[PDB]
Structures are given as C-alpha cells and as structure tokens.
Amino acid sequence: RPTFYRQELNKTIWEVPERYQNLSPVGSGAYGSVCAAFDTKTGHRVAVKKLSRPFQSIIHAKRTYRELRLLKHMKHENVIGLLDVFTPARSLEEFNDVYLVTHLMGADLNNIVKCQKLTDDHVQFLIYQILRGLKYIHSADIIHRDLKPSNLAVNEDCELKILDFGLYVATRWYRAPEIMLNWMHYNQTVDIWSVGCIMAELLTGRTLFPGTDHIDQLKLILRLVGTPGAELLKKISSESARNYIQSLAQMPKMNFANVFIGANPLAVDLLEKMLVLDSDKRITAAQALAHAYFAQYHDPDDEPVADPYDQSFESRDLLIDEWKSLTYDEVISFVPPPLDQ
Ligand SMILES: Nc1c(C(=O)NCc2ccc(C(=O)N[C@@H](CCC3CCCCC3)C(=O)NC3CCCCC3)cc2)cnn1-c1ccccc1
C-alpha cells in the first residue's frame, strides 16, 4: 500500500497516493471532481477523478461498478483507458471513496469545431479514429449511446480518444431517431448515426440537426433523410410512433451532394451510408473503416477487436453493499498497464 497524503480542493477532501503531485482542479466542475496532477512514476501529467457519492444508493453503486468494469476493459489507442484506480481505505469496511486515473486529454471537439470548420484531411483522420475505437467497443457488445463532440478528446497531435464524461452541447442533436422515439429495434449502429452527425458538423462548422426537443429533432432529421418508406414502416412495432410518422406530410430524401455542397464526394457518400433511417441498412464501424474516404489511413491489420466483456451483471438486482463489495474486488484486482514513453 502506498503512502497517501490529504488535502482540500474547491469544497472537497482529496486523499491520494504521493505518486500523484501538484493537483489542480480542471473544467470548473464541468467534468465533476477532476484534477490534473503530475504522476511521479512516469513524469507525465494525468487526470484524477474522485467519484461523487459512489455508493449513495443501489443505482449509484451499480453505476460506479459499471464505470469501473468498463474502464478496466478498454485497451485501445482510440478509447480512454485506466492508468490507475485507488481508494485510501484499507478494508471493505472503511471503503467509501473511489478515485480513477486516466491520461489528461488536451481539448474536446466542441472546443475545436467552435474554433473553425476543419480541413478534409483533418476530418478524415478524426473520423477514422472514432470509427477505429467504435469497431473495438462494438466488438465487445458495448454501445456508447452518447457520442457527441464533448465526448471526444483530441491532443495537439490530433490523436483522438472516445470517452463519456456524463452529466452547451445537447445529446439529442447526435442521437439516432430509433432510440429517441421507441428505444426498441436498435443496435450498435446508433453510434454510427452519431458519427455521421459529428462528421457533418466538422465538415460544415454547423450542427446538423439542432432540434429543440425530440419532436423538433425528428422533424429536422426527416427533412434531410425523408419520411420512412413502406419498408421501414413495416418494421415499426410501436403503433403511436407509426401513427405519428404516417400523420406527417411525406418528405423526400435529399440528395446529400446538394446539402454538403463542395465537400469531398467520398465524404458525402460515407454520410449517405451513415445517416440512413433504417438501422439494419446503416453502415457498421468495421464496414466504414474500409470505405474509400479513409484510403490514406485504413490498415486492416491495425484495427483490432476487443476481448469479450462480461455484461451479465447488468441483469442483476443487488443491494448497495453487494455492488460496493464487487467494486472493491475490482479495485483490488486492478493490474496497472505497461508504462510508455
Ligand atoms: N477532464 C479530463 C479527464 C478526466 O475527467 N478523466 C477521468 C475520466 C474518467 C472516466 C471517463 C469515462 O469515459 N468513463 C466512462 C467509461 C466507459 C466508456 C468509455 C468510452 C467508450 C464507452 C464506455 C463511463 O462509464 N462514463 C459514465 C460516467 C457516469 C455515467 C455516465 C457515463 C472519462 C474521464 C481527462 N482529461 N480531461 C480533459 C479532457 C479535455 C480537456 C481537458 C481535460
């Protein structure tokens, strides 16, 4: 067990191993209780997040467990990873605080597109990295579900990582129509819809579908992609949804080349494949990596899949102390990753 030191920062107690020095609040509470710190073991900067009320209820307890399991699984260049996890507690009995250490990421894509629309080369590279990380996540039957520019981090070198900071930039604007309506017939390609919305925004400088609510959101979508045809209508099991759709004045699919005017035609074509209303016809991440738009980056020998991930816990209903105990086990069993420089 290492030696811990205590301090207070912006209303909160912080008790961290001496390994981590020079703690400094980041994001002004936007990411929660997160400090930048210097990791004396590698001489790199890191971020340290102290979870807020991790075991307050059964649902927080399960959320905490879920986040820790997900972080311990992720081992890919384009997905956030876990450098360390610790608690000052010596026993399960004392266990009440969980700290997570990750790389300190440079800036998000909200705070880069809001600087300027990007070049087509920069778009190719950022979307390629998003898709490569999604191939990995999706291969373990993990769906992000909340992809948006503030959940993508990019250092000065344009290397990108997918994360999810949790609770400016609304989720609904990037959400797939099937899980903002019925939430029934959906798959991993909800994340691909989000990637199309992100990619559009990077190319144009403008949010593709800035809806005010779920109804307005949907209306903005249908204006580009057109109202569902008979074939998609056949697959809607929700009757109120089917009624709503069929109650609208029927709208034609736009020609995307007339919407994204002057864009690389290979970008336009890929957007056509991502922003399809029918989730069975939308391009997967693995398929999109092989699209000609990424010809400069695509390497089918360097686009790895994930180890399988046991999600069976998601179906369990357990007590707070059980979720707490499981989370303790995961802290104890953590194997730090290989150091890199
Ligand atoms: N602010 C920060 C941090 C920081 O906060 N690090 C800690 C951390 C911990 C967990 C996750 C995190 O992603 N959890 C996830 C893990 C699983 C997820 C990963 C991505 C693929 C899908 C699965 C998570 O479980 N979500 C939850 C959080 C609570 C409930 C909502 C979602 C993200 C960061 C680091 N750099 N910067 C920074 C970024 C830009 C500029 C300046 C500084």
UniProtKB/Swiss-Prot annotation:
Instruction: Mark the residues carrying the PTM N6-acetyllysine.
Output: 49, 148
Keywords linked to the UniProt accession:
Acetylation, Apoptosis, ATP-binding, Cytoplasm, Kinase, Nucleotide-binding, Nucleus, Phosphoprotein, Serine/threonine-protein kinase, Stress response, Transcription, Transcription regulation, Transferase, Ubl conjugation
The protein's location, in the record's own words, is: Cytoplasm; Nucleus
Question: PTMs?
Answer: Dual phosphorylation can also be mediated by TAB1-mediated autophosphorylation. TCR engagement in T-cells also leads to Tyr-309 phosphorylation by ZAP70. Dephosphorylated and inactivated by DUPS1, DUSP10 and DUSP16. PPM1D also mediates dephosphorylation and inactivation of MAPK14.
Characterize the regulation of its activity. Activated by cell stresses such as DNA damage, heat shock, osmotic shock, anisomycin and sodium arsenite, as well as pro-inflammatory stimuli such as bacterial lipopolysaccharide (LPS) and interleukin-1.
One family name in Pfam for this protein:
Pkinase
Q: Where is the active site?
A: 164 (proton acceptor)
Q: Spell out the molecular function terms from Gene Ontology.
A: ATP binding; kinase activity; MAP kinase activity; mitogen-activated protein kinase p38 binding; NFAT protein binding; protein kinase activity; protein phosphatase binding; protein serine kinase activity
Gene3D superfamilies registered for this protein in UniProt: Phosphorylase Kinase, domain 1, Transferase(Phosphotransferase) domain 1
Name all Protein kinase domain ranges.
Answer: 20-294
Q: Which domain of life is it from?
A: Eukaryota
> Which residues are recorded as modified (Phosphotyrosine)?
168, 309
Which residues are recorded as binding ATP?
Answer: 26-34, 49
Task: Indicate the impact reported for residue 168 to F.
Answer: Phosphorylation blocked
Stated role: Serine/threonine kinase which acts as an essential component of the MAP kinase signal transduction pathway. MAPK14 is one of the four p38 MAPKs which play an important role in the cascades of cellular responses evoked by extracellular stimuli such as pro-inflammatory cytokines or physical stress leading to direct activation of transcription factors. Accordingly, p38 MAPKs phosphorylate a broad range of proteins and it has been estimated that they may have approximately 200 to 300 substrates each.
Subunit structure comment from the entry:
Component of a signaling complex containing at least AKAP13, PKN1, MAPK14, ZAK and MAP2K3. Within this complex, AKAP13 interacts directly with PKN1, which in turn recruits MAPK14, MAP2K3 and ZAK. Binds to a kinase interaction motif within the protein tyrosine phosphatase, PTPRR. This interaction retains MAPK14 in the cytoplasm and prevents nuclear accumulation. Interacts with SPAG9 and GADD45A. Interacts with CDC25B, CDC25C, DUSP1, DUSP10, DUSP16, NP60, SUPT20H and TAB1. Interacts with casein kinase II subunits CSNK2A1 and CSNK2B. Interacts with PPM1D.
Family statement? Belongs to the protein kinase superfamily. CMGC Ser/Thr protein kinase family. MAP kinase subfamily.
Q: Report what the protein is called.
A: Mitogen-activated protein kinase 14
Organism (species) = Mus musculus (Mouse)
Q: Which gene encodes it?
A: Mapk14
